[PDB]
């Protein structure tokens, strides 16, 4: 399963 | 930007036997950027039902793909892979040699 | 006895029209098990291995939601990075991201990793401890500072040391028949004359899994790299891999030469000799 937390942009 | 030309291997899944079903592979690797055109050829013509793997990449960030089709080799037929990429002036054709 | 779960993401901008092309693939070891392609009609994460088809609709719904969110992050990043690098809106650019976790033979967390590239070059990566970042250039220092402020490492570490390992252990069990089986190479040697006085010996390793392998020629017991040739390890197409190594020798002296094969599926390395 893929990362399941909050997404963060560069 | 960084541009890397594809490495190409053309080979069968199993030892070639005339008149026996097999799989023809064209493995392209080491290239960047990802856009690439790959065809498998039979006596110079594009084979229709060629499939390919999903785009992935290596430790150096270069991409790799496998293109393949079922085929039945014979003595008279010749096979090849034809690749085009931004790093090539014209399509690069690599002949299938059964011994390698 | 260690195993890994890894995800690979590639986004490529399309400056002439529309949003980036986005491809995601997941692997356990050298086995692909899932994919997402923005160019496909389903717009869903899709199975690529039989053992993951055991998962029910809630799995596919959640993976789809999360992977589409990853795609949006990359879309934003491509726009941001164009500005960081003062680039034109006319070219196509690429973001790549890989992350994953390993378990050891004890089935416990071993290591985690998270790497990001822009235009095929290192951009930013988690350090080995999963608590700090390696920025490759001054652009990436912006990202590092932004991520440090938002405690991004801790969030990633939570997944890599937790959920990531739990998924891997589930997959390993569900897919045990293949994911935890090694396929030792099927090896053989060929011989053919290249003149009346020389011959080529070619050592083949076929149908092996995982991909890591070593093929080495020796002459009278010591490593021979001169007068040898090889191919890079390549996929057979059925989930296994292939490789060969060859040496040219004087005809009649074949028996001096040995091909040594090391692979994790072999309890001891194999030594092959011609007739």
């Amino acid at each position: 399963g893929v990362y399941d937390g909050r997404e963060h942009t560069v | 930007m960084i541009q890397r030309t594809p490495k190409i291997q053309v080979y069968s899944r199993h030892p070639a036997e005339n008149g026996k079903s097999n799989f023809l592979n064209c493995y392209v690797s080491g290239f960047h950027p990802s856009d690439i055109e790959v065809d498998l050829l039979k006596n110079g013509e594009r084979i229709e039902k060629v499939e390919h793997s999903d785009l992935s990449f290596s430790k150096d960030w270069s991409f790799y793909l496998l293109y393949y089709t079922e085929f039945t080799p014979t003595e008279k037929d010749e096979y090849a892979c034809r690749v085009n990429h931004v790093t090539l002036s014209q399509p690069k054709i690599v002949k299938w040699d059964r011994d390698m | 006895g260690s195993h890994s779960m890894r995800y690979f993401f590639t986004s490529v901008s399309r400056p002439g029209r529309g949003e980036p092309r986005f491809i995601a693939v997941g692997y356990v070891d050298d086995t692909q098990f899932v994919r997402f392609d923005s160019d496909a009609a389903s717009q869903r994460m899709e199975p690529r291995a039989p053992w993951i088809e055991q998962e029910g609709p809630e799995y596919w719904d959640g993976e789809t939601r999360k992977v589409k969110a990853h795609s949006q992050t990359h879309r934003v990043d491509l726009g941001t990075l164009r500005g960081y690098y003062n680039q034109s809106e006319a070219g196509s650019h690429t973001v790549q991201r890989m992350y994953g976790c390993d378990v050891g033979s004890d089935w416990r967390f071993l290591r985690g990793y998270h790497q990001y590239a822009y235009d095929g070059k290192d951009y930013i990566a988690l350090k080995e401890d999963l608590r700090s970042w390696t920025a490759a250039d001054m652009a990436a220092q912006t990202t590092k500072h932004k991520w440090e402020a938002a405690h991004v490492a801790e969030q990633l570490r939570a997944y890599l040391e937790g959920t990531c390992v739990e998924w891997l252990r589930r997959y390993l069990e569900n897919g045990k028949e293949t994911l935890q089986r090694t396929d030792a190479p099927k090896t053989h040697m060929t011989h053919h004359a290249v003149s009346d006085h020389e011959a080529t010996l070619r050592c083949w390793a076929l149908s092996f899994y995982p991909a890591e392998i070593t093929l080495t020629w020796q002459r009278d017991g010591e490593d021979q790299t001169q007068d040898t040739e090889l191919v890079e390890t390549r996929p057979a197409g059925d989930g296994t891999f292939q490789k060969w190594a060859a040496v040219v020798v004087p005809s009649g002296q074949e028996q001096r030469y040995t091909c040594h094969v090391q692979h994790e599926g072999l309890p001891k390395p194999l030594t092959l000799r011609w007739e």
Side-chain angles (χ1 to χ4, degrees):
Chain A
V2 298
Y3 171 67
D4 57 1
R6 188 171 188 304
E7 284 288 299
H8 299 274
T9 53
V10 301
Chain B
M1 302 178 262
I2 76 168
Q3 304 199 317
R4 289 174 267 179
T5 204
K7 299 167 291 174
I8 302 166
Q9 300 198 57
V10 183
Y11 58 101
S12 57
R13 180 183 300 174
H14 303 111
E17 308 293 313
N18 296 308
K20 301 295 192 318
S21 194
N22 203 329
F23 296 85
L24 184 57
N25 291 327
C26 180
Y27 182 54
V28 283
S29 66
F31 58 96
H32 211 292
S34 61
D35 291 359
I36 192 163
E37 181 174 47
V38 182
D39 293 304
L40 292 178
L41 312 175
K42 180 180 181 178
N43 303 312
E45 185 180 291
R46 181 174 177 277
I47 298 169
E48 290 296 325
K49 286 304 169 181
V50 171
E51 293 174 278
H52 62 85
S53 62
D54 302 316
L55 189 69
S56 195
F57 56 81
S58 304
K59 186 67 43 199
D60 65 2
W61 302 107
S62 68
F63 296 102
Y64 64 88
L65 294 163
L66 179 65
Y67 283 75
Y68 61 90
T69 184
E70 192 157 67
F71 85 130
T72 295
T74 56
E75 286 180 62
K76 65 179 186 172
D77 298 306
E78 299 293 322
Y79 302 85
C81 184
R82 180 178 62 205
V83 181
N84 199 26
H85 189 255
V86 61
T87 57
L88 299 177
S89 303
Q90 61 282 312
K92 174 64 178 181
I93 303 180
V94 180
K95 180 171 176 180
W96 176 48
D97 180 313
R98 304 181 173 210
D99 301 309
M100 290 207 285
Chain C
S2 63
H3 294 283
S4 71
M5 185 179 66
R6 302 184 186 116
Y7 288 95
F8 296 79
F9 306 90
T10 303
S11 291
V12 181
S13 67
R14 303 187 161 171
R17 178 177 74 233
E19 300 177 48
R21 177 72 178 281
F22 172 78
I23 300 170
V25 298
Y27 286 82
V28 170
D29 304 321
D30 294 320
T31 301
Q32 182 196 22
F33 70 102
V34 288
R35 70 147 207 171
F36 183 97
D37 187 335
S38 60
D39 263 27
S42 71
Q43 298 291 302
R44 296 281 285 183
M45 188 78 98
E46 299 171 304
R48 298 284 97 168
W51 48 264
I52 197 67
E53 299 188 59
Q54 297 170 39
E55 299 299 338
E58 85 293 347
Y59 176 85
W60 300 105
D61 287 350
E63 295 300 294
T64 296
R65 177 181 53 68
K66 294 176 299 169
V67 86
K68 289 182 59 166
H70 280 57
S71 79
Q72 295 297 345
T73 303
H74 284 193
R75 179 270 300 163
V76 172
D77 293 346
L78 281 159
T80 301
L81 289 159
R82 190 183 95 285
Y84 292 174
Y85 288 97
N86 188 51
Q87 293 160 154
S88 175
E89 306 183 317
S92 173
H93 299 272
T94 305
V95 291
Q96 289 162 268
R97 181 192 308 265
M98 184 282 289
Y99 60 73
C101 55
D102 302 344
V103 294
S105 303
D106 56 8
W107 290 61
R108 299 172 205 157
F109 175 78
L110 178 61
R111 70 173 69 75
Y113 32 85
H114 181 108
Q115 295 269 340
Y116 194 108
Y118 183 53
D119 285 336
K121 301 175 288 191
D122 296 335
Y123 181 75
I124 199 169
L126 224 28
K127 293 193 189 298
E128 190 71 45
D129 68 354
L130 313 178
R131 288 165 183 276
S132 59
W133 303 94
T134 300
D137 68 9
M138 291 309 291
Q141 284 288 75
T142 82
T143 302
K144 175 173 179 166
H145 293 152
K146 178 186 177 178
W147 289 359
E148 291 175 335
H151 313 296
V152 178
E154 173 179 284
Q155 292 170 56
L156 290 169
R157 179 171 61 78
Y159 162 79
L160 295 169
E161 301 181 329
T163 288
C164 189
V165 169
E166 292 184 77
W167 285 114
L168 175 55
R169 291 182 279 187
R170 177 178 174 76
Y171 300 154
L172 290 167
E173 177 183 351
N174 289 352
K176 69 184 182 292
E177 297 73 15
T178 49
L179 294 179
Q180 291 186 77
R181 185 188 83 208
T182 61
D183 300 352
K186 296 182 183 187
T187 65
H188 76 280
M189 196 181 299
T190 63
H191 177 278
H192 65 260
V194 298
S195 69
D196 306 305
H197 299 100
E198 294 88 31
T200 295
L201 301 171
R202 183 166 297 109
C203 187
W204 288 82
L206 293 169
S207 200
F208 58 87
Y209 183 94
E212 176 61 55
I213 197 165
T214 304
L215 300 180
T216 301
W217 278 101
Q218 294 177 197
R219 185 250 322 302
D220 292 322
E222 279 56 58
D223 298 315
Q224 168 92 56
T225 56
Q226 289 186 299
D227 311 302
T228 63
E229 183 165 68
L230 54 75
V231 293
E232 296 301 302
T233 301
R234 64 199 188 185
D238 63 5
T240 69
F241 298 87
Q242 314 184 333
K243 199 182 200 314
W244 59 257
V247 61
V248 177
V249 307
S251 314
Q253 303 304 303
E254 296 89 347
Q255 281 264 286
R256 297 187 190 267
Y257 297 79
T258 51
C259 171
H260 301 268
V261 186
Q262 298 172 88
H263 183 85
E264 74 159 68
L266 296 169
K268 63 183 299 176
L270 300 177
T271 298
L272 294 82
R273 186 148 31 208
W274 179 255
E275 288 173 32

